[PDB]
């Protein structure tokens, strides 16, 4: 049961578009989260009595940059956490969270990057989704572009969100074209591509690294929402997605009995397993999050109200909703983040405020 223990506001007064706890923080280290907004990323540490201790920021050299998204990983050789950030410039920056140095950056996307996600099993595999209608899969060990998910049969407008399934065998993406698309990355072609990305060392060869051009999703639907689809999450073999229509829909491709790995690209059907309604979230780019174990789901709305669903029930439609309000929290909440142990929930807002809720 959450209580609001603290809040603060960042000095830039611009929206905080993203927040992420570091789920790779070491045993006995305090809980750390990153916020992104304006042209900066800031790290904070959670301490007792609701204390949110300010650490250090990375500020982009370009005053016109606007960071939208961040995602945590770790260096696969040293174990040290890394933070990937991206936004309107379409440049991915890999940040050393200790010093806030930009270690390296990746350019490619035709435009703004709307989301970053790391593979659940491989800390080096970074997925970016873009205003340019495409997804890109990067290997941040060998600094290679593994594949581009695009084409006529891919998204036809900005991609706003994507999520890897549990094992990182497939991705579901969504965007402004109202569609949700499945891209399997466990095909013979994609698995070989990933392996080749690891064998690539530009200093030991003459060849450039060749990226896969993936031009056909393994499933596609526009039958779930009737506006911009701005957030998607796997829930096992089921999907959770939302638009700006005041609902999270729980659904699956095919008919009720259809196995996700038996779904063919021509699949015409979807099955709706439930829908979580809420209020006043008519603006787009408003993201829900889940805890580490996927026992709960949190979403903020456009007037600063938090919705939390308990998913620890037998069927999706039986989820139990709880609400969290504070009389001074009135700005739009863009994203939430649970600490890994689920003891803390952070919400960040359009007025640069940060809200801490302790369980």
């Amino acid at each position: 049961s959450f209580k609001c223990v603290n809040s603060l506001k960042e000095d830039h007064n611009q929206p905080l578009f993203g927040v992420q706890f570091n789920w790779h923080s070491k045993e006995g280290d305090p809980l750390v989260f990153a916020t992104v907004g304006s042209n900066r990323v800031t790290l904070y540490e959670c301490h007792s009595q609701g204390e949110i201790r300010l650490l250090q920021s990375y500020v982009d050299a370009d005053a016109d940059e606007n960071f939208y998204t961040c995602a945590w990983t770790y260096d696969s050789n040293t174990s040290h956490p890394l933070l990937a950030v991206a936004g309107s410039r379409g440049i991915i920056r890999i940040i050393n969270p200790i010093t806030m140095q930009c270690i390296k950056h990746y350019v490619g996307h035709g435009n703004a990057i709307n989301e970053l996600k790391f593979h659940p099993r491989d800390p080096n595999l970074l997925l970016s989704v873009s205003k340019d209608h495409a997804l890109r899969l990067w290997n941040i060990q060998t600094d290679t572009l593994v594949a581009i998910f695009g084409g006529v049969e891919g998204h036809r407008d900005e991609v706003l969100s994507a999520d890897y399934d549990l094992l990182g065998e497939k991705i579901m993406s969504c965007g402004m074209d109202h569609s949700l698309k499945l891209w399997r990355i466990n095909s013979k072609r994609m698995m070989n591509a990933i392996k080749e990305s690891y064998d690539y060392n530009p200093n030991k060869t003459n060849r450039p690294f060749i990226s896969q051009k993936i031009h056909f999703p393994d499933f596609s639907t526009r039958d779930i929402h009737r506006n911009y689809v701005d957030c998607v999450r796997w829930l096992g073999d089921l999907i959770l997605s939302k638009s700006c229509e005041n609902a999270i829909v729980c659904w699956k491709p095919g008919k009720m009995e259809d196995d996700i790995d038996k779904i063919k690209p021509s699949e015409s059907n979807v099955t709706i397993l439930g829908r979580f309604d809420y209020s006043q979230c008519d603006i787009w780019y408003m993201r829900f999050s889940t805890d580490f174990w996927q026992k709960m789901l949190a979403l903020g709305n456009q007037v600063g109200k938090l919705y939390v669903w308990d998913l620890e029930v037998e069927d999706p439609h039986k989820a139990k909703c709880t609400t969290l309000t504070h009389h001074k929290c009135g700005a739009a909440i863009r994203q939430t983040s649970f600490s890994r142990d689920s003891s803390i929930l952070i919400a960040v807002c359009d007025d640069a405020s940060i809200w801490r809720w302790d369980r």
Binding site: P15, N227, Y228, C244, I283, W284, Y285, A332, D350
Partner: peptide, 7 residues
């Protein structure tokens, strides 16, 4: 139709 930020 669909705003990113509140008017």
């Amino acid at each position: 139709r669909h705003r990113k930020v509140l008017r």
